[PDB]
Structure formats: C-alpha cells, structure tokens
Amino acid sequence: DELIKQLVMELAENSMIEAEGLKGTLDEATQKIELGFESLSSLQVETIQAIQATDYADSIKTLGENIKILDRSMKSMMETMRLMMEKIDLLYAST
Amino acid sequence: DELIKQLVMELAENSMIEAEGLKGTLDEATQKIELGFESLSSLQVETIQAIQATDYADSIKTLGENIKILDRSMKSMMETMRLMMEKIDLLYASTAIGN
Amino acid sequence: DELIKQLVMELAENSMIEAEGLKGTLDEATQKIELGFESLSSLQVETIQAIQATDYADSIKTLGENIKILDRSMKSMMETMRLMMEKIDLLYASTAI
Amino acid sequence: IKQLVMELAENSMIEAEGLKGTLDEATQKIELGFESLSSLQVETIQAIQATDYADSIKTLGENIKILDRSMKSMMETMRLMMEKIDLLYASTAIG
C-alpha cells in the first residue's frame, strides 16, 4: 500500500529520467545528421565546381591551332629549300 | 486506494506521450538519414557519369599524331640540308682548288 | 480491486509493445546508416578512380617529349644553316668573274 | 499485485539501457561515417586541384610558337642565301 505507492512513484521517476536521456541523445543525433549532410553536400558541390574549373578544352584547341601554323611554316621552308637546291645546281653547272 | 489507480493512470498516460514523442523523433531521424543518403548518392552517380563521358584522350591522340607528322618532315628537311651542304662543299673545293 | 491489476497488466504489455517498436526502428536505422556510408564510400572511391582514369598527365608528358624532339631537329637545322652561310660567303673569294 | 509492478520496473530498466546502448552506438557510427567520407571528399578535391593541366598544354603551345618563329627566320635566312647564289651566278660567263 505504502510500499506499492513507493514502487509506482519510482517507476514514474526512473521512466521519465530514461525517456529524457533518450530524447536528449536523439536531438544531438539529429543535429549531427543535419550538419553531416550539410557538409557532405557542400563538398560534393565543391568537387563538381573544382572539376568545372579544371576545363582545358580551350588550351587544346589553341595548341592544335599553333601546330597547324608551324605545319604551314614547315611547308614554305620545304618549298624554299627546293628553289634553293635548283639555284645551287644552276650555279654549279654554270661555273 | 484511488491513489494507486490515479498514480498508474497518470503514469500510463505520460509513458505513451513520451513513447510516441520518441517514436516520431526516431522516424523523423530515420527519414532524414534516408533522404540524406538518397540525395548525396544521386549527385555522386551523376558526377561519375559526367567524368566518364569526358574525352580529351581523343584530342591528345590527334595532337600526338600531328606532332609525329611534323617530326617525320623535319627529319626529311635535315636530309635535304645535308645534301645542300655537300653540293656547296663541291662548289667550294672545285672552284678554290681547280680554278 | 482487479482495476489495479488490469491497468498495470495493460501498461506492462503495451509499454513492452512500444519498447520493441523503438528497438526495432533503432535496429533498422543503424542498418540504414551502415548501408548508407558503405554506399557513399564506394561511390566516392569510384569517383576518385573515374578521375585517376581521366588523368592524362602522362599523355601530355609524351606530347612534351615529342615537342623536345622537334626542338632538337630545329637546333640541328639552325647549326647547319650557320655553317652553310659561311661556306656561301667563302664562294665570294673562290668563284671567278 | 507488488509483482505485476516490480517485473515492469526491471523489464523497463533493461529495455531502456538496451535502447540507450544501441543509440550511443548509432551516434558514433554516424560521427565516423561523416569524418571518414568528408576526408575522402577532401582527398578527391585535392586530387582534382593537383590534376590541372591547362597550363601544361599552354606551355606546349608556347614551345610550338617558338619553333614557328625559328622556322620563319630560317626561311628568311635561306632567301638571303638564294640572293647570294643568284649574285654569284650573275657573275659567271653563263649568267
């Protein structure tokens, strides 16, 4: 009666202490989950933005353009060297 | 007594409020986790796809071919210039020593 | 009365219903956190490998090695052109009018 | 009865520490996921930021432009060489 009254009031004290404990921890876990996904998402966007920045499709276009220019300069040199070879042959023949 | 019945009825009522309060907070936490992993996982998949579909390799190949072609031509031009030097040498020796 | 018996037998049986409800959800949640980070870790490793396999530093390397060879042919031609001009100038002393 | 209640208090004490232990374990499995994945993301970003080669390709473009200038200047030197050969030829019996 007085012992059963102690038991029940003990249950209600210990239950609500435990219920609080578990509540407080869940809130901490919820803060943890919110911040953790906020950071993973931020770094995932930085990854995409860093890959975006590393674009060098334009570097390659420009390099290919200077190679074609050197190619055209080389073809003129070869033409010039054919004409020079002929003037050498002429001079030697004409000595 | 009516005391123990009132203590139990109060205990029972509060226990179910705390339990349903815990249950809902755990479901909200589980829902958040699921949506967290779901959303990040979608964007990482699309990140891998888009990396895989880049093709600079094709372009670096072409440039390497075009440089091999320039290299072959320059070896050809070095041969022409050796012959040109030999013909100049023959002109020099033959006019100097002959004449 | 059996009204103290009933109310408690009810609170005992459904508070155990609740507790298993929580234990079961907490055991799902845990399993999901594990399979979650396993999934993102694996995708992140696959990201790093997708990047590594589109790293062409070595292909650019070879490109640069091959441009160094053109440079060395150009150096060789420029030296031959220097010697040639000197031999042509020497013709001005040896070639009769 | 005193027993109906006393068993409840114990079964509820143990279910409770049963729960707090799986929770604190989840709370830590979560700190380790975020710490682990986040540093793996930092790696990834750092392995993109070490992998930029727009400058590498620009440098090769510059090497090509230097070769083009030497090629064009050799062509102007050989056109002088041709003028020198023509003058010599102009001076022979035949030219």
Side-chain angles (χ1 to χ4, degrees), chain A residues 1-2 4-31 33-55 57-95, chain B residues 1-2 5-6 8-17 19-21 23-99, chain C residues 1 3 5 7-16 18-96, chain D residues 1-3 5-93 95:
Chain A
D1 334 315
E2 62 273 29
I4 270 163
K5 195 205 161 215
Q6 288 304 321
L7 269 37
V8 163
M9 288 172 146
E10 257 192 29
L11 203 63
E13 198 195 333
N14 292 353
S15 273
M16 287 297 105
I17 285 165
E18 200 87 53
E20 221 126 296
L22 272 44
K23 180 187 72 219
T25 302
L26 265 165
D27 299 343
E28 289 175 1
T30 287
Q31 191 81 350
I33 292 156
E34 188 189 30
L35 295 166
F37 283 128
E38 201 192 38
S39 158
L40 295 191
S41 157
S42 151
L43 255 53
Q44 201 181 40
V45 163
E46 270 174 59
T47 300
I48 291 172
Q49 276 171 351
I51 295 156
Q52 184 183 10
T54 60
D55 187 20
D58 259 298
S59 282
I60 272 169
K61 167 192 78 92
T62 301
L63 170 59
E65 273 162 23
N66 302 345
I67 287 159
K68 293 156 72 73
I69 290 173
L70 174 50
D71 186 79
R72 289 194 287 279
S73 296
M74 193 166 314
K75 279 157 187 194
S76 305
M77 189 49 183
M78 287 161 79
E79 179 176 297
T80 301
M81 292 175 73
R82 299 191 294 273
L83 289 167
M84 176 62 170
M85 200 73 107
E86 180 177 7
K87 294 165 171 305
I88 292 161
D89 287 334
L90 188 58
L91 171 60
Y92 173 61
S94 309
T95 285
Chain B
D1 304 323
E2 295 137 65
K5 189 169 72 224
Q6 276 194 300
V8 160
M9 284 186 301
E10 293 338 313
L11 168 51
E13 191 272 325
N14 283 222
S15 169
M16 291 301 97
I17 290 183
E20 282 120 48
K23 233 298 163 172
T25 294
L26 187 61
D27 290 341
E28 280 180 55
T30 293
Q31 221 143 352
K32 268 193 164 48
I33 282 139
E34 268 197 83
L35 182 67
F37 286 123
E38 207 172 71
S39 188
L40 282 169
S41 181
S42 166
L43 185 49
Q44 214 54 51
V45 170
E46 300 306 331
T47 305
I48 286 143
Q49 294 294 347
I51 295 160
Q52 288 184 341
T54 58
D55 69 1
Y56 294 138
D58 188 47
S59 300
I60 291 168
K61 172 163 216 172
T62 299
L63 300 163
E65 289 161 16
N66 289 322
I67 282 146
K68 249 132 59 67
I69 286 173
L70 291 190
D71 186 22
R72 198 176 63 177
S73 300
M74 294 206 73
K75 294 190 222 152
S76 167
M77 290 168 55
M78 289 167 66
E79 293 300 321
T80 302
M81 266 181 83
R82 161 196 46 77
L83 174 59
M84 275 186 41
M85 197 107 325
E86 287 168 1
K87 281 163 130 79
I88 294 308
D89 282 341
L90 167 51
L91 246 177
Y92 185 46
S94 57
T95 55
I97 285 147
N99 314 115
Chain C
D1 256 61
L3 194 60
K5 220 106 71 223
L7 289 176
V8 70
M9 259 157 65
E10 175 185 30
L11 167 58
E13 287 298 340
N14 78 25
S15 75
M16 140 222 139
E18 300 317 85
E20 291 158 347
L22 286 168
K23 158 213 193 62
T25 301
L26 187 56
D27 293 5
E28 265 172 21
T30 291
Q31 181 175 314
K32 265 190 249 286
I33 285 149
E34 276 148 49
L35 287 180
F37 289 119
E38 275 173 21
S39 185
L40 279 175
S41 268
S42 177
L43 288 172
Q44 199 63 31
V45 164
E46 188 185 0
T47 307
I48 289 160
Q49 298 176 342
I51 282 150
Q52 278 171 2
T54 62
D55 164 44
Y56 296 123
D58 168 67
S59 292
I60 288 157
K61 182 50 64 231
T62 291
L63 218 58
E65 288 169 354
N66 290 337
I67 288 175
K68 282 187 190 169
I69 293 160
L70 295 184
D71 189 71
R72 288 197 289 271
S73 302
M74 192 69 67
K75 284 173 181 151
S76 162
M77 309 212 86
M78 284 165 52
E79 181 51 50
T80 295
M81 283 291 288
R82 278 185 292 274
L83 295 162
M84 208 147 86
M85 184 69 85
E86 184 180 331
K87 289 170 165 159
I88 291 157
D89 277 345
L90 282 174
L91 294 178
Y92 277 73
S94 75
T95 300
Chain D
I1 312 188
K2 187 148 50 52
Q3 288 229 294
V5 180
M6 260 183 173
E7 190 174 357
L8 187 48
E10 301 304 276
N11 300 1
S12 56
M13 172 155 217
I14 81 176
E15 270 173 332
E17 66 200 298
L19 279 156
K20 181 199 182 168
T22 308
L23 190 58
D24 279 346
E25 176 265 20
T27 303
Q28 292 222 256
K29 199 150 297 205
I30 277 154
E31 291 151 341
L32 258 46
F34 285 130
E35 174 251 297
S36 176
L37 190 42
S38 177
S39 44
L40 219 56
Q41 288 180 308
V42 164
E43 256 154 61
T44 304
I45 294 167
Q46 286 181 351
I48 293 152
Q49 287 178 338
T51 326
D52 194 35
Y53 301 133
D55 199 63
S56 208
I57 282 97
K58 287 283 172 214
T59 282
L60 293 189
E62 285 165 354
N63 289 353
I64 295 299
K65 270 144 59 185
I66 296 180
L67 288 174
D68 191 54
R69 291 200 315 270
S70 312
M71 184 59 64
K72 284 188 156 100
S73 124
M74 270 185 39
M75 190 164 80
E76 291 299 323
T77 298
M78 192 162 284
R79 282 163 170 171
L80 174 65
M81 283 183 172
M82 289 169 62
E83 298 287 353
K84 290 195 181 176
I85 296 294
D86 289 349
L87 277 166
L88 283 178
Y89 170 78
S91 86
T92 63

